[PDB]
Amino acid sequence: AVAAGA
């Protein structure tokens, strides 16, 4: 699981 941002 990879999440980037805000």
CSV table of C-alpha atoms in Angstrom, one decimal:
chain,number,residue,atom,x,y,z
A,1,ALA,CA,0.0,0.0,0.0
A,2,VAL,CA,1.4,3.3,-1.1
A,3,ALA,CA,-0.3,6.6,-0.5
A,4,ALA,CA,1.0,10.0,-1.3
A,5,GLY,CA,-0.5,13.4,-1.0
A,6,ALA,CA,-2.7,15.0,1.6
